[PDB]
């Protein structure tokens with residue numbers, strides 16, 4: 462259908478899949494606010510209009526964080542959306558540190574659409590950490606998240622100047638470069 466209808470299909474799908482989940486801020490914000498915010502970063506700041514990229518951004522956490530399967534994504538949204546979502550889906554069969562390390566290792570080799578989603582996802586989470594230290598976190602755990610995110614984003618450059626410039630500003634504010 463129209464761009465709008467296609468976006469609302471993905472937004473409503475993600476809202477239902479994430480309905481019982483909450484972010485780790487003290488207030489426990491509904492999890493769906495994150496994928497919506499990531500996708501809005503892409504339209505409002507990055508100038509993105511590719512509906513496949515924007516659908517993937519709304520859905521980028523459904524397979525990683527819920528029972529949703531990659532085949533279910535393709536079933537409702539097609540193969541280009543499914544391939545994007547797969548690219549940004551951590552292998553939850555792996556230990557946390559290996560997932561953290563693979564994001565650094567696999568950042569340069571991702572498709573342009575996956576780099577856009579990865580950049581916007583990092584930008585949302587770093588803004589969130591600045592806004593509110595998550596429940597149970599120390600201030601130096603926040604800094605270290607930034608130190609790791611900088612290593613990932615280093616591998617994502619050459620994709621979108623607006624997002625990369627915004628990330629560079631946040632990293633610089635905490636003494637981190639590129």
Ligand SMILES: NC(=O)C1=CN([C@@H]2O[C@H](COP(=O)(O)OP(=O)(O)OC[C@H]3O[C@@H](n4cnc5c(N)ncnc54)[C@H](OP(=O)(O)O)[C@@H]3O)[C@@H](O)[C@H]2O)C=CC1
Pocket residue numbers: 483484485486495522557558561582586587589590595599601602605606
């Ligand atoms: N320095 C320290 O004091 C400590 C550091 N650590 C380190 O932290 C890691 C812990 O791993 P893990 O259990 O995955 O915890 P994470 O460090 O992975 O938690 C951060 C993740 O939570 C999601 N998230 C949910 N709510 C928020 C929010 N309000 N703001 C930002 N992000 C949010 C984001 O993922 P998404 O975008 O997918 O929602 C984000 O990537 C280990 O790698 C360990 O080395 C661990 C213990 C102490």
Ligand code: NA
Pocket residue numbers: 557
């Ligand atoms: Na994690």
Ligand SMILES: [Zn+2]
Pocket residue numbers: 495496499521522582
């Ligand atoms: Zn995310």
